[PDB]
């Protein structure tokens, strides 16, 4: 067992002490601490992790790089024991160059998504059908989403009467429609092993439309829950204050919040080109500001902040609202008689179950991937997290075509209004 993080923390910390010089034994004290850290860093090599065997063309080369690292440490160490602090610091500059090679080697392999279509570890027929499965789910979500939410845009948007309810369903329909309309670009990207055959402009346009509407979808779901909660708990306040004019103002909130949380996509998402002929639409971590050492710490904190916001703001906030609001509604109906209970109980327990079943797996996988970010960076561990992204993503994406039946067409006025709008159709 060994921790590469504390090793490279010791290596970078002592490299700064060597630049301070100020003495001769101070360079020797730092280089000795660097040599101990480089030895442990050689012990933390993933030799057993990737084909455990002696004398290998790819396993004995990552261990040979530390020999050149330890070799350069001795070069600066022999010149330090001779009192010459100038030749010792000059040899430490080459020691920084190889350190920048390992940091870039960690960042490039990290920003490169693992192409599970060519890896031998996922060659079995089981993994082969589990890669087509999220593609099929996105396929049926594309057709059902653009039609299901398209009908709501037409019916509840132009055929029904402008109420607070129809405005809520229209915004929810415009969110899921704009999202599901980008599924063809994401299904061919997932089918090519996370590659991006589209331009740099589409890499930023599509993933912004995705993050804005998906954030909007869950935020509006919680907004509908809040509005439904106030009607049942405060019916007198609703008829005297719940107006269409007020709903026009307070509903821009969820969209502004979805727009701000998408700024990281607008600024740091771009098309990167791997050394061979492969293009990926990801965060270009190996092309940010500061020293290469600084690019390592800002990459973890950025993805940590992104994983926290995805879980807390993107799930804990709407899930708590949905659970509490419909829970307070279930208590208000349990109080008085069954006058308001015109909708079956399967309707009340579906908006809280469909939102949880669809989002919790993906939110759980993305959350585990955030707490194991460093384990994936220094060791490439927890590859099951990457494997489960697409399957759990498609499940959450499928919620964008279930909301029409859960919220809109579950009522009586919407379903019959759609029938009379289409001429000569089956009932």
């Amino acid at each position: 067992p060994a921790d590469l993080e504390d090793n490279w923390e010791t290596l970078n910390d002592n490299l700064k002490v060597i630049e301070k010089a100020d003495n001769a034994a101070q360079v020797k004290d730092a280089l000795t601490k660097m040599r101990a850290a480089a030895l442990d860093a050689q012990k933390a090599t993933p030799p057993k992790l990737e084909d455990k065997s002696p004398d290998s063309p790819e396993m004995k080369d990552f261990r040979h790089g530390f020999d050149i690292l330890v070799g350069q440490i001795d070069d600066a160490l022999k010149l330090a024991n001779e009192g010459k602090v100038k030749e010792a610091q000059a040899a430490a500059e080459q020691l920084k160059t190889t350190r920048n090679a390992y940091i870039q080697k960690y960042l490039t392999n990290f920003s490169t998504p693992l192409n599970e279509y060519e890896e031998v570890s996922y060659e079995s027929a089981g993994y082969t059908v589990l890669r087509i499965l999220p593609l099929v789910v996105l396929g049926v979500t594309f057709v059902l989403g653009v039609l299901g939410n398209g009908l709501v845009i037409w019916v509840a948007g132009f055929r029904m009467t402008r109420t607070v309810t129809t405005i809520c369903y229209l915004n929810l329909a415009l969110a899921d429609f704009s999202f599901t309309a980008t599924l063809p670009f994401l299904i061919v990207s997932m089918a090519m092993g996370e590659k991006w055959p589209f331009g740099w402009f589409l890499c930023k346009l599509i993933h912004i439309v995705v993050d804005i509407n998906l954030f909007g979808s869950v935020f509006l779901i919680g907004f509908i829950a809040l509005d439904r909660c106030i009607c049942v708990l405060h019916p007198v306040w609703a008829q005297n204050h719940r107006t269409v004019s007020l709903a026009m103002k307070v509903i821009v909130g969820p969209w502004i919040l979805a727009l701000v949380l998408t700024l990281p996509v607008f600024l740091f998402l771009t098309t990167v080109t791997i050394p061979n002929g492969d293009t990926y639409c990801t965060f270009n971590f190996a092309s940010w500001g500061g020293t290469p050492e600084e690019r390592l710490k800002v990459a973890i904190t950025m993805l940590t902040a992104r994983g926290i916001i995805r879980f807390v703001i993107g799930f804990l906030l709407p899930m708590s609202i949905v659970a509490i609001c419909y829970g307070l509604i279930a208590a208000k109906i349990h109080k008085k008689g069954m006058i308001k209970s015109s909708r079956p109980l399967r309707v009340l327990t579906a908006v809280v179950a469909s939102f949880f079943i669809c989002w919790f797996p993906f939110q759980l996988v993305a959350l585990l991937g955030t707490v194991w970010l460093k384990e994936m960076l220094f060791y490439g561990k927890y590859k099951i997290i990457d494997i489960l992204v697409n399957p759990t993503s498609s499940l959450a994406f499928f919620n964008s075509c279930l909301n029409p039946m859960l919220y809109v067409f579950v009522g009586q006025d919407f379903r019959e209004r759609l029938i009379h709008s289409l001429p000569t159709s089956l009932e």
């Binding site: 998504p113 993933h207 998906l214 954030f215 998402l269 993305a366 997290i385 992204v389």
Partner: peptide, 6 residues
């Protein structure tokens, strides 16, 4: 690690 929506 892969790019995740959210």
């Amino acid at each position: 690690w892969k790019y995740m929506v959210x």
